[PDB]
Amino acid sequence: MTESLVLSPAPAKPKRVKASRRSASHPTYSEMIAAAIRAEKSRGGSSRQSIQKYIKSHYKVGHNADLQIKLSIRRLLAAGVLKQTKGVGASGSFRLAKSDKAKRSPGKKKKAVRRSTSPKKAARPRKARSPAKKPKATARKARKKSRASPKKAKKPKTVKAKSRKASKAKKVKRSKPRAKSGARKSPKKK
Amino acid sequence: MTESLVLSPAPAKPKRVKASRRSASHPTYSEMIAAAIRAEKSRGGSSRQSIQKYIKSHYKVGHNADLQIKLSIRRLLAAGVLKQTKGVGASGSFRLAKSDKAKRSPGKKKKAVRRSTSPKKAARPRKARSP
Amino acid sequence: STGGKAPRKQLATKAARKSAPATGGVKKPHRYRPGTVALREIRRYQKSTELLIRKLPFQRLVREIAQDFKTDLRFQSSAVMALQEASEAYLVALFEDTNLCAIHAKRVTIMPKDIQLARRIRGERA
Amino acid sequence: KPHRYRPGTVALREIRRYQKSTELLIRKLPFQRLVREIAQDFKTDLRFQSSAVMALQEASEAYLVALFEDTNLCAIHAKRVTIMPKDIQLARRIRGERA
Amino acid sequence: GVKKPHRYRPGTVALREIRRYQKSTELLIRKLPFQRLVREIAQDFKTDLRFQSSAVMALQEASEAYLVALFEDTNLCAIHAKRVTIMPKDIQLARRIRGERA
């Protein structure tokens, strides 16, 4: 812990702390890596260049951040807050431990049928003139539970019945007729 | 049964703000205690009362959830994604998969600071005499 | 039935709580717990009247020790069986004391810490 | 202020004195009266010899100290320094003195 | 408050140790601890055996050189496995090809 490493090069590091103002959302030094982690939007995670780009909006170009990132990753590993994926498909992709619980691997079918219906919902009205409406094709029950038509139909009735506000119920015949009006514009008839 | 019959109230109780594109509650038992552990100011994690305060909101499943909380904590232990800290007066130290217990020298652990009474304690003397 | 392609959140209506180890939701907590099934055996074994270790391997065990002591030895069926019953009750009697030693240390299962204490008090060891 | 000793330590130096001993630690006269009294409960008007009374004491002293060492091994199993009624009853049961 | 030492990185002093030990002509095992070992090994099969200091030195030198040559032989197995560690996997393999196990 020699002087040429504790006082000679130090002044740069304490001088630049907790000042990532340009990214207003969570500018804390410890939270930049984590903010990149939620912003990545991928199962594998963020690799080195991905995390560097996601952190880089301003205030960060890397005079010493290239090695400071490795040092912070070592600190986060000592804290046990990092979960990652190996392989050459993802060149050291990293994630923060966001309770995305690890479990046994086997049981990976080569399709995702439940989300396979979403692209068709995106495509069909968008291919039509009437743009993609609000997520009304399937309700919140779609990821509440996973059941067939009778159980996915009885529950919306309870959803609407438990909300007994007449004023709230008035909106279902004032926000929906907009679709009826737009059905005149997008197709020429019916 | 434990996921299709017993949790019949599960579609019913968190029915409203367990799914919302603006902001939604944490699904099932996967990650309820996650944000509770992270956004935390206590030096010794949660104590089975801060857990209730953190999870408790406008709506919750809340049906025999004391059983499921303990069961989930123990199963997450057995898998290896929960790690705790020893103590007596801390009323338990529930933390996440953060591996902060493996290698660390014993020197006591006391972090506690928050400026909530301090503004009021500063406003009290001026209020007693001349605002 | 929230799914999510994750066990303990998966479907257990395809599986069963009634002894279907196929991966799914969490099973029923009792699950014929080891305490319950063990109580079945202790009730049955403390009521029945039978030998509870294999006969010929025990006879082979005595033959192995006998060969070292005497090059050629002749045995009787009654003598081997007589040795077995005393030997069977020897560990039965020890386990009664071994179980009592476990309760003393606020414990329920017998461990090698118990056997060293029980035998020394009896005078078998040291 | 007295020099004092930490509790439980004086037992260690007492052990090195009492293990290295060739005497009886129970006063002979109370033991002699005790033996005569309990004997009267089964047979009245009995005479005793000094050697015979000492013989009962010597057997009793060895019986108790042997039990204490056996009881001591029960104390460590309980993860405590102090031996207690729970220790003695367990030791007696294994030793066959509880029947 | 002692000044923090200039700690060498792990394995750095191994080069310095090699310089001394390659030039070393001493015996790494002490005399009396090895004397008790050889006496018991002989006693295990035949009792009432005497010993000489010169004979003890002969037993030590042959055993040490046997192990010393093994380590260099074992090292050639490590590089073949793309590593520098010495493991029982390396040790068992090193003996087997040369013999001493059959």
What whole-number distance in Å separates Cα of residue A50 and Cα of residue B29? 31
**Chain C partners within 8 Å of B70 (Cβ):** none
Instruction: Output the DSSP codes for C81-112.
Output: HHHHHHHHHHHHHHHHHHHHHHHHTT-SS--H
φ, ψ dihedrals at B46, nearest 5°: -90, 165
In which element (H, E) is residue A94 found? strand A94-96
What whole-number distance in Å separates Cα of residue E69 and Cα of residue E64? 9
For E6-102, CATH gives 1.10.20.10
Which candidate, D26, D6, D29, places its Cα nearest to that of D18? Answer: D26
- Cα dihedral C68/C74/C79/C83 (nearest 10): 10
Question: Which residues of chain C approach chain D closer than 8 Å at the C-beta?
Answer: 97, 100-101, 104-106, 113-114, 117-118, 120-122
Three-class SS string for A95-125?
EECCCCCCCCCCCCCCCCHHHHHHHHHHHHH
CB spacing of C6 vs B30 below 8 angstroms = yes
Bin A28: left if φ > 0, else alpha if -120 < ψ < 50, else beta.
beta
**Chain D partners within 8 Å of C97 (Cβ):** 93-94
Instruction: Output the DSSP codes for B11-55.
Output: TTTTTTTSS-SS--PPPTTTSHHHHHHHS---TT-B-SSHHHHHH
For D3-99, CATH gives 1.10.20.10
Q: What is the DSSP letter of B89?
A: T
What whole-number distance in Å separates Cα of residue B32 and Cα of residue A14? 36
* Interface probe with C: pick from D68, D73, D90, most Cβ of C within 10 Å: D90
DSSP-assigned beta bridge partners for residue B84? B94
What whole-number distance in Å separates Cα of residue C6 and Cα of residue B74? 17
Three-class SS string for B59-77?
CCCCCCHHHHHHHHHHHHH
Neighbours of A107 (CB within 10 A): 11
Determine the residue type at B51. I
Q: What is the DSSP letter of A31?
A: G
What whole-number distance in Å separates Cα of residue D92 and Cα of residue D82? 17
| Joined tokens for residue C87 | 């030997």
The three-point CA angle B23-B28-B32 to 5° equals: 65
Nearest CA in chain A to B98: A80
Task: Count contacts between B and C (CB, < 8 Å).
Answer: 38
CB spacing of C120 vs D73 below 8 angstroms = yes
Nearest CA in chain D to C96: D94
- Kindly state which CATH superfamily the domain C30-126 is placed in: Histone, subunit A (1.10.20.10)
Which candidate, B85, B95, B88, places its Cα nearest to that of B37? Answer: B95
Check if the beta carbon of residue C65 is closer than 8 Å to that of residue C83: no
Strand ranges (E), D1-99:
none
What whole-number distance in Å separates Cα of residue A156 and Cα of residue A152? 7
For this experimental structure, what is the resolution in angstroms?
3.6
Contacts of A140 (CB under 8 A, 6+ apart): B18, B19, B20
Residue matched to tokens 């005149």: A184
Q: Where are the domains of chain E?
A: 6-102
CB spacing of B28 vs C11 below 8 angstroms = no
Q: Considering Cα of D65, then D69, then D70, then D74, what sign does the dihedral take? A: positive
Which candidate, A115, A73, A120, places its Cα nearest to that of A97? Answer: A73
> Measured between CB atoms, which of A101, A114, A145 is closest to C1?
A145
Neighbours of chain D (3+ CB pairs under 8 A): C
Counting every residue written for chain C, the total comes to 126
What whole-number distance in Å separates Cα of residue A16 and Cα of residue A26? 16
φ, ψ dihedrals at A95, nearest 5°: -135, 155
Q: What is the DSSP letter of A56?
A: B
Q: Considering Cα of E9, then E14, then E17, then E19, what sign does the dihedral take? A: negative
Q: Could you give the 3-state DSSP secondary structure of residue C16? A: strand
Q: What is the DSSP letter of A55?
A: H
> Measured between CB atoms, which of B1, B30, B75 is closest to C12?
B1
Contacts of A17 (CB under 8 A, 6+ apart): A29
